[PDB]
From Swiss-Prot:
Residues 108-130 form a coiled coil. Interacts with ESR1 and NCOA3 and these interactions are enhanced by estradiol. Interacts with acetylated lysine residues on histone H1.4, H2A, H2B and H3 (in vitro). This is ATPase family AAA domain-containing protein 2. Residues 3-114 form the Bromo domain. Transmembrane segments: none annotated. Highly expressed in estrogen receptor positive breast tumors and in osteosarcoma tumors. The chain holds residues 981 to 1108 of 1390 of the full protein. Induction: Up-regulated in breast, uterus, colon, ovary, and stomach tumors. Induced in breast cancer cells overexpressing NCOA3 or treated with estrogen. Down-regulated in 5-fluorouracil-resistant derivatives of the colon cancer cell line HCT 116. May be a transcriptional coactivator of the nuclear receptor ESR1 required to induce the expression of a subset of estradiol target genes, such as CCND1, MYC and E2F1. May play a role in the recruitment or occupancy of CREBBP at some ESR1 target gene promoters. May be required for histone hyperacetylation. Involved in the estrogen-induced cell proliferation and cell cycle progression of breast cancer cells. It is found in: Nucleus. Belongs to the AAA ATPase family.
Length: 130
């Protein structure tokens, strides 16, 4: 229905706005672009599903997210991948892990404040109907 297509357009507007606000934060710069496989060829041999904020933006636009739960699965991957690939005690690794955790915490706090639970419930009921 046009009502349902209006619902998903509003979801995509909301997801673009959250993602833009994560992407412009100086702490999250390293998560805005894919890991360069030339300059880091080991990444793909040890991380199963790479994710970054530029790939989240592409997926919003290709209509890959039909719920906020689906979007948060990708934000969680950005964080868990950073923790996996940079596990050591050196300051370079500790700083990346601190910034990865702050990304996930910031995304969850925006959504907690700004997402209406009835709007997410409607997205879920339309998704389960298809
Ligand atoms: O589920 C797993 C664990 C894992 C880590 C990394 C890569 Br690449 C593939 C897999 N398979
Ligand atoms: Cl820096």
């Amino acid at each position: 229905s046009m009502q349902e297509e209006d619902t998903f357009r509003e979801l995509r507007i909301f997801l673009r706005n959250v993602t833009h606000r994560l992407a412009i934060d100086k702490r999250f710069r390293v998560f805005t672009k894919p890991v360069d496989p030339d300059e880091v060829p080991d990444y793909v041999t040890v991380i199963k599903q790479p994710m970054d904020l530029s790939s989240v933006i592409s997926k919003i636009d290709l209509h890959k997210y039909l719920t906020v739960k689906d979007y948060l699965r990708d934000i969680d991957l950005i964080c868990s991948n950073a923790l996996e690939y940079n596990p050591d005690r050196d300051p370079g690794d500790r700083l990346i892990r601190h910034r990865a955790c702050a990304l996930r915490d910031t995304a969850y706090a925006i959504i907690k404040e700004e997402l209406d639970e009835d709007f997410e419930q409607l997205c879920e009921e339309i998704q389960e109907s298809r």
